[PDB]
Amino acid sequence: EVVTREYTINLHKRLHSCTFKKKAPTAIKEIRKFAQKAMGTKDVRVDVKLNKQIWSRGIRSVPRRVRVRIARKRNDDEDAKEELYSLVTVAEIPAEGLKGLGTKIIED
Amino acid sequence: VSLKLQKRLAASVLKCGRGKVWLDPNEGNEISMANSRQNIRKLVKDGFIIRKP
Amino acid sequence: PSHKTFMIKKKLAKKQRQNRPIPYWIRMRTDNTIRYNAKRRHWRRTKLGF
Amino acid sequence: VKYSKEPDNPTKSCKARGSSLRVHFKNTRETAHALRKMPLDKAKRYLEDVLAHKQAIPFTRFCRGVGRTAQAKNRHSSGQGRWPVKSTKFILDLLKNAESNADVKGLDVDLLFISHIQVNQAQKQRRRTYRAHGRINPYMSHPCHIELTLSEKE
Amino acid sequence: THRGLRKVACIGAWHPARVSYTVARAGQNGYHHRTEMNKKVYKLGKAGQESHAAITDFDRTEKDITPMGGFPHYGVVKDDYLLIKGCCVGPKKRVVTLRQSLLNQTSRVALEEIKLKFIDTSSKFGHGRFQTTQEKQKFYGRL
Amino acid sequence: GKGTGSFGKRRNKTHTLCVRCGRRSFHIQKSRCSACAYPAARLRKYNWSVKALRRKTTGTGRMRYLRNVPRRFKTNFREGTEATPR
RNA sequence: GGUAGUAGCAAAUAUUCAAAUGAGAACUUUGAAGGCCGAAGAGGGGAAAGGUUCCAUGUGAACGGCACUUGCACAUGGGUU
RNA sequence: GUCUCCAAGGUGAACAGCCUCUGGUCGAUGGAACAAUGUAGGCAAGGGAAGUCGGCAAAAUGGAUCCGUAACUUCGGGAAA
RNA sequence: AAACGACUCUCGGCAACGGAUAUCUCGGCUCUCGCAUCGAUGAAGAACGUAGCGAAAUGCGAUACUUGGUGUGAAUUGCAGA
Ligand SMILES: [K+]
Ligand SMILES: [K+]
Ligand SMILES: [K+]
Ligand SMILES: [K+]
Ligand SMILES: [K+]
Ligand SMILES: [K+]
Ligand SMILES: [Mg+2]
Ligand SMILES: [Mg+2]
Ligand SMILES: [Mg+2]
Ligand SMILES: [Mg+2]
Ligand SMILES: [Mg+2]
Ligand SMILES: [Mg+2]
Ligand SMILES: [Mg+2]
Ligand SMILES: [Zn+2]
């Protein structure tokens, strides 16, 4: 199915005691695995803006919690091995902040 | 396709470093079609090749 | 170097001309035994020693 | 060409082979040993799983210093196994060629099984390394010949 | 020491020409079966029987055995439990076997009647300074 | 430092191509060839190197003029004449 | 041959995301981000030494101690006023 | 290992160390885990050379301003005592 | 229950690796014989060029894998053309 949701990901606990030079690439891999587990899709594409946000504070200072939007879409390409793929983009943080924010369904 | 020649010629024509040359990622075919400094100058005039600040 | 003598330059020209593969039609000659150019030279492998 | 083992009924069999393949002879032998006497579809699935790192080829003869995994438990009790993707790819290509030959011959692929498969050493190719104290050492590769014949069950 | 210093320098003499079983060698450490003797039961807390609580005659604060924030890595004790002097084998959550003594306990230590005066229930996940969450809330003015 | 480090300093040619024998044996500072002793009038040759003698002896080259001597001797060095017209 | 698919591949801070091409992309090209050289440089030229390694196009095999669509490799052309 | 020319901003005495601009570059085969033993780099309560052939190694001191500076001396120094 | 399999070893068929063996030979080695002919009228050697398509070998010298005379008498040849 085609479903869009917004999640909060705790990268702090996932990257606890991660070597500095691999912390941000490990965060990228962490987000990819999170999307894979959440949406059931092996093929996950990380938006350039989300990559920018992850890397915005260098290779060490990955944000503790990140608000992402994961959208599962049907792959139009016929030569693709997977019928569906996941797209991970940034999500807007409410004024009150991340406190009290759960998983949300975006699709109308 | 490879645009190494275009990058080098654009840097030479703009009199800037190769790291300050911007080749439009959406105009790859027409940029690759250029193989002379005159073509590079035409592309620069058209705006497909820009010197970054 | 950029500064080179005329004789050395001519010798290098001859070496460049000699550094090439054999013509293909040589292999079709009657009673041919030449398989390839056994005297090929590469600037990094064997130096001319001039 | 004459294979090491000829099929009992050549009319109901196909063959494939490759010579001087640029792949490690020992890994290729391990893969062939794992594959012997298996149905064609099961062999294809097994090789695909090996490529995906879901099943492991048990390393049995050339196993000195090989690690152990739980994936090869059912085949090799000691658990010594690996995932030689290069050898698996080459053998899968040979199997595809054999299946195409069977299709041309008119055999039905459902009951095909690997009647015979063999790996031999080919001519070694030479490179070199540089060792301490101005010494030079051989740096050789070990290509292999591979042959296989599929037969119709029963 | 060239080649490292965390070793046994000499692992044996020339003769016998073999390493013996008595020489220290590197290998598995921990996860060994053990039987420890003479652990004294300091209390027997029975669920719902005014003995599960950590209250004593001296200290009358109404509190339970579980420390503030729960037992680290274990949880909340609610069933019957034994308070034993000293330490016991294994990490937290490990199943342990309690065995009746095989010896005749006649020593003064074994016969001693111990009366608990205070049982600490402060948080063990840090330098706990409060015995109860209610006490902490009173201290911080949130109740 | 007498090995690999020392080998890094090689950019002054002791020898260059010899005008006479063509070998890279012309000692520049001595201004003389270690192979043929150019510019000395006589060629440098020694009997204690038969291999060196046979590498450069007569016959190893072209023999532009010498090769034709036997034919002229066989004709007795006949000159100033031609075969009878056809 | 055994050794043995073993010893090893570890200095010079570091890569990541999207797209293009391609049978095949961690390694080719474009863009974006995050880093390094920090002007007695990992920048820009010369002397010696080398001799075509320079530039364009294309690429079976070998080589580039993994890999390559790639290249100081290979093949065909051009270039030093 | 191999001669030489050019040489920005900040801090700072300083072509010291550290960061940055132009220019260059991420080229050192990659992935997973974080056992012993190693290599490189730290910390460690109380004691303070008891270690060891031997204070080996490490630690301690360190810039600038002010006060002050002994024996001895070839009268110059010692002295940053 | 030490059976089936794996490993090691061993024997046999086949297939590999390698180039021994056998049969060859426009080459070598040895003996014997005939002749006497390099160069300032520029030798030997050394360099560079030269073919429609050649790098080497062989040949040749800007008349450059050959010019001319004579003999023989229908080719050269890997391809193309004359
Ligand atoms: K192992
Ligand atoms: K390609
Ligand atoms: K001491
Ligand atoms: K002593
Ligand atoms: K056999
Ligand atoms: K003639
Ligand atoms: Mg080496
Ligand atoms: Mg604690
Ligand atoms: Mg002189
Ligand atoms: Mg300077
Ligand atoms: Mg180039
Ligand atoms: Mg200043
Ligand atoms: Mg023979
Ligand atoms: Zn000479």
Of the bound ligands, which one is closest to the alpha carbon of residue D67?
Answer: 1
**Contact status of C50 with chain F (Cβ, < 8 Å):** yes
Report residue D131: phi and psi, to 5°. Answer: -110, 170
Residue to substitute from F16, F20, F23, interface C, most C β-carbons within 10 A: F16
Rounded to whole angstroms, the distance from the CA of residue D12 to the C1' of nucleotide G27 is 46
Query: Using the beta-carbon criterion (under 8 Å), do F17 and C49 form an inter-chain contact?
Result: no
Q: What is the 3-state secondary structure of chain B?
A: CCCHHHHHHHHHHHCCCHHHEEECCCCHHHHHCCCCHHHHHHHHHHCCEEECC
**Contact status of C49 with chain F (Cβ, < 8 Å):** yes
Nucleotides of chain H in contact with protein CB (under 7 A) are 1-2, 22-25, 32, 34, 36-39
Which among D71, D16, D74 has a CA at the least distance from the CA of D40?
Answer: D16
Alpha helices in chain D (DSSP H): 25-35, 40-52, 85-105
Chain C residue with the nearest C-alpha to that of F25: C50
Contact in structure between E82 and E139 (CB atoms under 8 Å)? no
Solved with: cryo-EM
Which residue approaches I59 most closely, CA to C1'? F62
Rounded to whole angstroms, the distance from the CA of residue D150 to the C1' of nucleotide H80 is 92
Residues with CB under 5 A from ligand 9 (ion): F 31
Taking only Cα atoms into account, the Rg of chain A, rounded to an integer number of angstroms, comes to 14
Which among D30, D24, D17, D18 has a CA at the least distance from the CA of D125?
Answer: D24
Query: Using the beta-carbon criterion (under 8 Å), do F24 and C7 form an inter-chain contact?
Result: no
| Residue F25 annotated in ligand binding | no
Long-range contacts of C10-19 (CB under 8 A, 24+ apart): C11/C50, C11/F17, C12/C48, C15/C41, C15/C48
Q: How far is the CA of C33 from the centre of ligand 13 (A)?
A: 22
* CB neighbourhood size of C3 (10 A): 4
Which residue approaches G30 most closely, CA to C1'? B25
Subunits in contact with chain D (3 or more CB pairs closer than 8 Å): none
Residue E81 amino acid letter: Y
| Residue F34 annotated in ligand binding | no
Which residue approaches H22 most closely, CA to C1'? B17
Chains F and C touch (3+ CB pairs under 8 A): yes
Of the bound ligands, which one is closest to the alpha carbon of residue B2?
Answer: 2
Q: Which nucleotide has the shortest C1'-to-CA distance from D24?
A: G5
Which among D56, D51, D68, D61 has a CA at the least distance from the CA of D26?
Answer: D61
Resolution in A: 2.2
Contact in structure between D58 and D72 (CB atoms under 8 Å)? yes
**Contact status of C1 with chain F (Cβ, < 8 Å):** no
Q: Which nucleotide has the shortest C1'-to-CA distance from A25?
A: G16
From CA D48, how far away is CA F26, in angstroms rounded?
69
Which among A11, A13, A42, A16 has a CA at the least distance from the CA of A28?
Answer: A11
Helix (H) or strand (E) holding A69: strand A65-74
Contact in structure between B44 and B10 (CB atoms under 8 Å)? yes
Enumerate the β-bridge partners of residue E49: none
Q: How many residue contacts between C and F have a Cβ separation below 8 Å?
A: 7
Enumerate the β-bridge partners of residue D58: D81
| Cα–Cα distance list, F74 to B14, E142, F78 (Å) | 80, 135, 9
- Strand I at less than 7 A from CB of F32: no
Rounded to whole angstroms, the distance from the CA of residue B13 to the C1' of nucleotide G59 is 31
Distance from CA of C50 to the nearest CA of F (A): 6
From CA B16, how far away is CA D24, in angstroms rounded?
50
From CA F19, how far away is CA F35, in angstroms rounded?
11
From CA A65, how far away is CA A87, in angstroms rounded?
19
